[PDB]
Design a protein around this nucleic acid. Sequence first.
DNA 1: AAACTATGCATGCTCTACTGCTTCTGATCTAGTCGACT
Length: 57
Amino acid sequence: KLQGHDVDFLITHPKEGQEAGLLPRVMCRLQDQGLILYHQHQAFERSFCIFRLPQPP
DNA sequence: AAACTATGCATGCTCTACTGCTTCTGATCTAGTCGACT
Ligand SMILES: Nc1ncnc2c1ncn2[C@H]1C[C@H](O)[C@@H](COP(=O)(O)NP(=O)(O)OP(=O)(O)O)O1
Ligand SMILES: [Mg+2]
């Protein structure tokens, strides 16, 4: 598809047994960066958000 | 020699405080239902 309504990703680690708490850390880091308008919760393995994309113009 | 007053005792009622036991209430928590999303 060339058009959509959302962008969906899947995060994994080829090595077994390391992504115990990956998502909270990445989400909080992005929030510190200042891009998440909405976090589903503001250990979980799923979340939907509303990113803040800066357009080139 | 008699009357007044200092001293004390015995008892009931009341404020005040303190310690301990029991019960009630505010606060900390899992099941059911509807709804959101993917
Ligand atoms: N009700 C459901 N039942 C089963 N699987 C589902 C599902 N809803 C989603 N999935 C699975 C399959 C879906 O591909 C994926 C999430 O896809 P989306 O972001 O909800 N819709 P997409 O991005 O594909 O299209 P568009 O750009 O037009 O909005 O999760
Ligand atoms: Mg999507």
